[PDB]
Ligand binder design. Structure first.
Ligand SMILES: *[C@@H]1O[C@H](CO)[C@@H](O[C@@H]2O[C@H](CO)[C@@H](O)[C@H](O)[C@H]2NC(C)=O)[C@H](O)[C@H]1NC(C)=O
Ligand SMILES: *[C@@H]1O[C@H](CO)[C@@H](O[C@@H]2O[C@H](CO)[C@@H](O)[C@H](O)[C@H]2NC(C)=O)[C@H](O)[C@H]1NC(C)=O
Ligand SMILES: CC(=O)N[C@@H]1[C@@H](O)[C@H](O)[C@@H](CO)O[C@H]1O
Ligand SMILES: *[C@@H]1O[C@H](CO)[C@@H](O)[C@H](O)[C@H]1NC(C)=O
Ligand SMILES: *[C@@H]1O[C@H](CO)[C@@H](O)[C@H](O)[C@H]1NC(C)=O
Ligand SMILES: *[C@@H]1O[C@H](CO)[C@@H](O)[C@H](O)[C@H]1NC(C)=O
Ligand SMILES: *[C@@H]1O[C@H](CO)[C@@H](O)[C@H](O)[C@H]1NC(C)=O
Ligand SMILES: *[C@@H]1O[C@H](CO)[C@@H](O)[C@H](O)[C@H]1NC(C)=O
Ligand SMILES: *[C@@H]1O[C@H](CO)[C@@H](O)[C@H](O)[C@H]1NC(C)=O
Ligand SMILES: *[C@@H]1O[C@H](CO)[C@@H](O)[C@H](O)[C@H]1NC(C)=O
Ligand SMILES: *[C@@H]1O[C@H](CO)[C@@H](O)[C@H](O)[C@H]1NC(C)=O
Ligand SMILES: *[C@@H]1O[C@H](CO)[C@@H](O)[C@H](O)[C@H]1NC(C)=O
Ligand SMILES: *[C@@H]1O[C@H](CO)[C@@H](O)[C@H](O)[C@H]1NC(C)=O
Ligand SMILES: *[C@@H]1O[C@H](CO)[C@@H](O)[C@H](O)[C@H]1NC(C)=O
Lengths: 203, 237, 318, 426
């Protein structure tokens, strides 16, 4: 099943402040008005990188696994959000093909009402997390509006992620190499965007 | 100084230009603008000036009643040009600049032969005497690339300068056609004052016009009116 | 659609028919001309090499380039003042008007200076509003407050003394008598002025008013001047952006060649950045010489319009 | 100026001669408050150690190796390296690393180092002989021994398990005496970078977080987002930074620079000169802050004159009254109130015939360059390379030939306007 990305899935491309200015950038971005997969779970390809977004109010989605097998043979990022904590570990975990709840080990780390939105990519041995939270007036699909996702985690994990799964509505889109024009406002925030490939006006 | 650089002569020698400036001047003196229009028609020089005064709204009798004064002013003014030109070379700055820029361009183009451009020597015969062909070609590619880029730069400069000098030549050609061969009414195109005539004189790489112009001198204030009432009707001048 | 060239009009010609105007409109038409670029100078050693001694030494092997690029931009920079000089400095004295405004009913108050405004006219203040490293910018020789004194002088001469201040001393003449000369200059007999003087003044005063509204309503009328600023900003921004280009070297961050490679590898790599940046600078200087030649053509045209069209009355149709 | 112009005589003018550039007073370095240093106490001061015949290991990566201090500290009596300089341990790094470790009688305990001596090294105790990184060793008598030689100590793959108990004892002789060693075999492990105080308002060379520049640093109002470290200008140039130790934002500005330009009368008149530092404030460099920059060696004057030597922004200079260089706001011309009224006219009663010279250039010097003879000094070997660049020489010589012919045409269009050679009467 499917819905549409509309204006969403932009994220701050680099650790740089620019203000009251228009800037051109090329990266893995979620293409505008692209179709996105829809879910309420299966195991999915990572592709070049993921856009993930879920309507939330109670942490029904517990987190994710990222890796290749997600089982025993090679290292995988277990990622969990558990009340006051966010927790990450890198083992070749011996868990089930899809771990669930009701109502090698080289690294570890510790850190509807809303839409929670995220972007994940894995480049040059570094894994990136970008995110945003927003209050909402729609929960049936991603609302046509704009809010750039901002980085949380940036780690030289060295693993070759190719596959992932949710831990437990939500939507999955995929990044593609594109050129974007970004509107940085006077306060250094991204406030609007154009994808040059969307249509001839956008070019 | 002579490494493939060469200077060609002009088509016209300065002695030929001096005959053209003689011809233009002798036409202008003996026949006014008429030699510009068609055949040269002789006219006495005072009567030419009488036409030229009438060409600036000054009535012909204002020449003839003042002819000796006007001749003395003109003869004196020509004398002051010789003094001005004799006193300093800095008057001819527009011509000397065009000579100097070309000398600087060629001296820069020549001095650039001495530059290494990242080769082991800028004396090409060093490379050829010191290295085997497989090694020498890697060095000579640097000198060729550098010298060629320097020569492309010099030619680019000369194209742009040649366009600037063409604009000056078109301006001079226009000046001669209107300002020597005619009496241009175009205010301050032919020097300050109301234009009368001009005489061209040749110069190295250029032309010099002596513009002759009527400039008003002593003046008086008057009460004035646009019109005068007579028998209730208004008269205008 | 296939465009139309204009409205079609058969002229009602025949061997004994003439049309003669029974009336006229005075009109005022704006014309705008560029006169100078932003005077610019580049330290090519600072542009090519970011204070790196290794790079600065390598650049010496290229000889005269950094000298003749400075000379080329300096020639352009001096010419911008020469253009501005030949356009505005056409008058031997700073003429100024009397305090009174007895110009026969004509009203120049919108184009004459206001001392409460820098001292500029109201229409000059519209125009000043509607227009908007190793590299450096140099000021013009004449400031905007100086140019406004020359435009005031040329204007005060033109109002008080006809063309005569272009031919010699400024001879005063009443404005309604200057216009009788201007009318005889177009073959309209002077009593047509006097028998219509209030109408002519009303048309003129009204037309000057409409220039303010035309300049206020759209910037598109003033496009030539804004474009000359845009082109120079775009050229300089291009020349800055080209510092980031690799030209086949491992990185355009010059210290991240030097701190990363052995000296022979670093020198062979830096010679790419030197070659690329130097070719980028030669390109920019060539663009500015050609652009300056265009602006010089505009300045010589403007200087000729000052001489014929302000200081005189040109019969050159259109 | 004489050297800039390659001349012993200089005419009146302004000449640019050099670029002034405020020098970096010092180098700043900033990196974050240091953290996650490597647990070398857990390597060298460990509560137990494996035999040299059975060497253990532990992680030495994603943590900062302050190893230059550890090598001089009491944790080791000796040290060595298999693929690095021993002095590099202040700042050396690897993407991953581990500390292999063991203890024994000193002849076998020396095997606890990369490619070490004795067969027990390659059989068990050592890192591989080709392995990168370094090792350290010390006396083990504090724990790694027993009175008759400790049976937990022993000797004979690298960092692995045919073997027997060691002589390691408090009463042992020089070869049997208890010793222990570890090999920290080979970005994540990196030795700690230093930092300076953050000196503002001076021109400074700087590093922040591995970017570098030279500039003036000042407190700023710019509101970076928390993850942003660097600010940018419209065209790529860094304009601000976060200090990694104090999370406020500082501006950057380039250290002040500009053309040194020399105002001079002719040397055929005086050797007195004045210097304009274009654009700069006089604080950076008989002194006069023009709108064009700081001027030095010229007298400011309240009179005004025609502009003799131009400076900029309405300022000009000249050599005048016993005499010196003056600088003044240029006069545009004498002012004149025209005597206008609704009924006054001025009429000239007399005239002067003026004669005014006007001068125009018409031709450049007709020049041609034989591009092959210029590029190659008669060398056929050079000419054969020039052919690889194709049409350029033919094109350049064609372009100069077009210019050369045009000079005859300019001369023709100016002077050949008369169809006949008129001659005067005598
Ligand atoms: C010539 O044209 C002008 C307008 O350009 C005429 O002036 C207008 O005349 C009407 C009455 O017919 C007035 O209501 C307007 O106020 C006038 N306009 C202005 C600007 O004053 C003028 O009447 C025409 N004259 C002739 C002889 O036809
Ligand atoms: C000249 O024209 C200007 C407008 O172009 C006139 O200025 C206006 O005059 C009225 C009456 O005094 C004021 O209410 C306005 O505020 C003025 N506007 C401005 C911009 O000043 C001016 O009065 C006219 N002067 C003469 C001598 O006719
Ligand atoms: C790597 C390390 O810290 N080693 C410690 C050393 O600092 C300390 O001085 C010693 C007791 O004196 O114990 C050991
Ligand atoms: C993809 O997008 C188009 C509109 O662009 C839509 O009609 C189509 O149903 C979508 N397909 C899927 C599989 O989402
Ligand atoms: C989150 O999970 C970790 C173990 O994965 C546990 O140590 C921690 O206490 C938990 N925190 C909360 C707030 O439940
Ligand atoms: C990690 O590798 C070790 C052997 O090197 C193995 O014992 C351990 O089971 C691995 N981790 C997992 C989660 O299987
Ligand atoms: C990751 O993939 C690259 C090739 O893309 C390979 O060289 C590398 O060894 C892989 N690393 C792991 C830990 O699988
Ligand atoms: C910028 O932030 C301030 C508060 O820091 C806020 O008052 C202002 O409205 C913001 N402006 C914009 C253009 O977002
Ligand atoms: C004309 O008269 C005025 C005074 O009415 C005087 O200022 C001016 O100098 C006079 N000009 C001449 C040429 O006499
Ligand atoms: C760094 O440490 C100092 C005290 O040593 C403290 O004032 C400062 O706030 C710390 N900065 C950070 C980013 O933790
Ligand atoms: C130049 O100097 C000489 C004396 O050295 C002097 O005779 C000559 O008149 C000077 N020329 C000028 C133009 O000042
Ligand atoms: C910069 O120059 C101005 C005058 O142009 C002066 O007021 C100011 O104090 C100078 N700034 C410094 C830091 O000296
Ligand atoms: C210029 O003149 C004023 C008085 O008008 C005087 O105060 C000032 O000191 C003078 N300038 C200099 C540099 O002395
Ligand atoms: C006109 O001016 C000349 C000098 O240019 C003078 O000799 C002559 O007497 C003047 N004539 C009158 C009428 O003023």
């Amino acid at each position: 099943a499917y819905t549409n990305s509309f204006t969403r899935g932009v994220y701050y491309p680099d650790k740089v402040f620019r203000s009251s200015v228009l800037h051109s950038t090329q990266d893995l971005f979620l293409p505008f008005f692209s179709n996105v997969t829809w879910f309420h779970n299966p195991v999915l390809p990572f592709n070049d990188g993921v856009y993930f977004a879920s309507t939330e109010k109670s942490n029904i989605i517990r987190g994710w696994i990222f890796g290749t097998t997600l089982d025993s043979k090679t290292q995988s990022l277990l990622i969990v959000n558990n009340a006051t904590n966010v927790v990450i570990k890198v083992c070749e975990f011996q868990f089930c093909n899809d771990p669930f709840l009701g109502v090698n080990c080289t690294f570890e780390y510790v850190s509807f009402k809303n839409l929670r939105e995220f972007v994940f990519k894995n480049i040059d041995g570094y894994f990136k997390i970008y995110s945003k939270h927003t209050p909402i007036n729609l929960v049936r699909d991603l609302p046509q509006g704009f809010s750039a996702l901002e980085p949380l985690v940036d780690l030289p994990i060295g693993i070759n992620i190719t596959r992932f799964q949710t831990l437990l509505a939500y939507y999955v889109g995929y990044l593609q190499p594109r050129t974007f024009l970004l509107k940085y406002n006077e306060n250094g925030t991204i406030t609007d965007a154009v994808d040059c490939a969307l249509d001839p006006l956008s070019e | 100084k002579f490494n493939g650089l060469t200077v060609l002569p002009p088509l016209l020698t300065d002695e030929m230009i001096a005959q053209y400036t003689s011809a233009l001047l002798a036409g202008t003196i003996t026949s006014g603008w008429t030699f510009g229009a068609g055949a040269a028609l002789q006219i006495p020089f005072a009567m030419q000036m009488a036409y030229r005064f009438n060409g600036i709204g000054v009535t012909q009798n204002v020449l003839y009643e003042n002819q000796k004064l006007i001749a003395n002013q003109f003869n004196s003014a020509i004398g002051k040009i010789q003094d001005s030109l004799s006193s300093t070379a800095s008057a001819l700055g527009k011509l000397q600049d065009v000579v100097n820029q070309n000398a600087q361009a060629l001296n820069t183009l020549v001095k650039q032969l001495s530059s290494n451009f990242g080769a082991i020597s800028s004396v090409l015969n060093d490379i050829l005497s010191r290295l085997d062909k497989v090694e020498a070609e890697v060095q000579i590619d640097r000198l060729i690339t550098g010298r060629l880029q320097s020569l492309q730069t010099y030619v680019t400069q000369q194209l742009i300068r040649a366009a600037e000098i063409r604009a000056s030549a078109n301006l001079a050609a226009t000046k001669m056609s209107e300002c020597v061969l005619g009496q241009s009414k175009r205010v301050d195109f032919c020097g300050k004052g109301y234009h009368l005539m001009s005489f061209p004189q040749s110069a190295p790489h250029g032309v010099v016009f002596l513009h002759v112009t009527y400039v008003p001198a002593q003046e008086k204030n008057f009460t004035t009116a646009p019109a005068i009432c007579h028998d209730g009707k208004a008269h205008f001048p | 659609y296939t465009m139309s060239l204009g409205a079609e009009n058969s002229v009602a010609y025949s061997n004994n028919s003439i049309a003669i105007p029974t009336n006229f409109t005075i009109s005022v038409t704006t014309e705008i001309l560029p006169v100078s670029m932003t005077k610019t100078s580049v330290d090519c050693t600072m542009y090519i090499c970011g204070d790196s001694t290794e790079c600065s030494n390598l650049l010496l092997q290229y000889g005269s380039f950094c000298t003749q690029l400075n000379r080329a931009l300096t020639g352009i920079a001096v010419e911008q003042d020469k253009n501005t000089q030949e356009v505005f400095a056409q008058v031997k004295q700073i003429y100024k008007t009397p305090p009174i405004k007895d110009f026969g009913g004509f009203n120049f108050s919108q184009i004459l200076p206001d001392p409460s405004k820098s001292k500029r006219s109201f229409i000059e203040d519209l125009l000043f509003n509607k227009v908007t490293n190793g590299l450096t910018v140099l000021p013009p020789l004449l400031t905007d407050e100086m140019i406004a004194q020359y435009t005031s002088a040329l204007l005060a001469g033109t109002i008080t003394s006809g063309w005569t201040f272009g031919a010699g001393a400024a001879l005063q003449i009443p404005f309604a008598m200057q216009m009788a000369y201007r009318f005889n200059g177009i073959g309209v007999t002077q009593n047509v002025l006097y028998e219509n003087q209030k109408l002519i003044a009303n048309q003129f005063n009204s037309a000057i008013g409409k220039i303010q509204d035309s300049l206020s309503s759209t910037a598109s009328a003033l496009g030539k001047l804004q474009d000359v600023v845009n082109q120079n900003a775009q050229a300089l921004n291009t020349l800055v952006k080209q510092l980031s280009s690799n030209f086949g070297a491992i990185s355009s961050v010059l210290n991240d060649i030097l701190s990363r490679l052995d000296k022979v590898e670093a020198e062979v790599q830096i010679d790419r950045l030197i070659t690329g940046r130097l070719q980028s600078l030669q390109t920019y200087v060539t663009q500015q010489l050609i652009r300056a030649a265009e602006i010089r053509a505009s300045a010589n045209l403007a200087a000729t319009k000052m001489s014929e069209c302000v200081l005189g009355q040109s019969k050159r149709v259109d | 100026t004489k050297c800039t112009l390659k001349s012993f005589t200089v005419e009146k003018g302004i000449y640019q001669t050099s670029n002034f550039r405020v020098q970096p007073t010092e180098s700043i370095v900033r990196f974050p408050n240091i953290t996650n240093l490597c647990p070398f106490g857990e390597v060298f001061n460990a509560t137990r150690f494996a035999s040299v015949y059975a060497w253990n290991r532990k992680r030495i990566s994603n943590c900062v190796a302050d190893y230059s201090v550890l090598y001089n500290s009491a944790s080791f009596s000796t040290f060595k390296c298999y693929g690095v300089s021993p002095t590099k341990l202040n700042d050396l790094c690897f993407t991953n690393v581990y500390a292999d470790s063991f203890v024994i009688r000193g002849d076998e305990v020396r095997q606890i180092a990369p490619g070490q001596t004795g067969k027990i090294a390659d059989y068990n105790y050592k890192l591989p002989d080709d392995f990168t990184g370094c090792v350290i060793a010390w006396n083990s008598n504090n724990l790694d021994s027993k009175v008759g030689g400790n049976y937990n100590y022993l000797y004979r793959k690298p960092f692995e398990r045919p073997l027997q108990s060691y002589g390691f004892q408090p009463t042992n002789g020089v070869g049997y005496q208890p010793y222990r060693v570890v090999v920290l075999s080979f970005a994540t492990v990196c030795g700690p970078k230093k930092s300076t105080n953050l000196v503002k308002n001076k021109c400074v060379n700087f590093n922040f977080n591995g970017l570098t520049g030279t500039g003036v640093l000042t407190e700023s109002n710019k509101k970076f987002l928390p993850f942003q470290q660097f600010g940018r200008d419209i065209a790529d140039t860094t304009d601000a930074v976060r200090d990694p130790q104090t999370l406020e934002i500082l501006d950057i500005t380039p250290c002040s620079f500009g053309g040194v330009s020399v105002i001079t009368p002719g040397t055929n008149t005086s050797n007195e000169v004045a210097v304009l530092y274009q654009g700069v404030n006089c604080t950076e460099v008989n002194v006069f802050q023009t709108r064009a920059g700081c001027l030095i060696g010229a007298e400011h004057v309240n009179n005004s004159y025609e502009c003799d030597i131009p400076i900029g922004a309405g300022i000009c200079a000249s050599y005048q009254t016993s005499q010196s260089i003056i600088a003044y706001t240029m006069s545009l011309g004498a002012e004149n109130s025209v005597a206008y009224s609704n009924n006054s006219i001025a009429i000239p009663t007399n005239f002067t015939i003026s004669v005014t010279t006007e001068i125009l250039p018409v031709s450049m010097t007709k020049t041609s360059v034989d591009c092959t003879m210029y590029i190659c000094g008669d060398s056929t070997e050079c000419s054969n390379l020039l052919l690889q660049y194709g049409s350029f020489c033919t094109q350049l010589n064609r372009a100069l030939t077009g210019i050369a012919v045009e000079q005859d045409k300019n001369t023709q269009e100016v002077f050949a306007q008369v169809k006949q050679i008129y001659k005067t009467p005598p």
